[PDB]
Amino acid sequence: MPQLNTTVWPTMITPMLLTLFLITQLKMLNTNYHLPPSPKPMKMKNYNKPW
């Protein structure tokens, strides 16, 4: 198995650490789902007059 040549492990670990904990997460953090527009046509409490 080449998976066990434990002199090439750092060069496989560290760029994964980057691309999984930094770059992909930044790529997500720029993906935002705005809440749907809820145009409530009913927002009117002014009052009656003093009478």
């Binding site: 009117m44 002014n46 009656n48 007059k49 009478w51």
Partner: protein, 54 residues
């Protein structure tokens, strides 16, 4: 906006309550005055025609 405008129209028409108070007071006192007129008129004619009848 249209609700505000309708409220404005109502509060424009507001003054009828007060002028109705006015009308009722005026009519009441006029009625009382003419009732006094007829009271005294009727009763003095009643005395007069009592004398006539007897």
């Amino acid at each position: 906006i249209d609700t505000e405008k309708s409220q404005q129209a109502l509060v424009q028409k507001r003054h009828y309550l007060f002028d109705v108070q006015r009308n009722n007071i005026a009519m009441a006192l006029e009625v009382t005055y003419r009732e006094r007129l007829y009271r005294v008129y009727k009763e003095v004619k009643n005395r007069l025609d009592y004398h006539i009848s007897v």
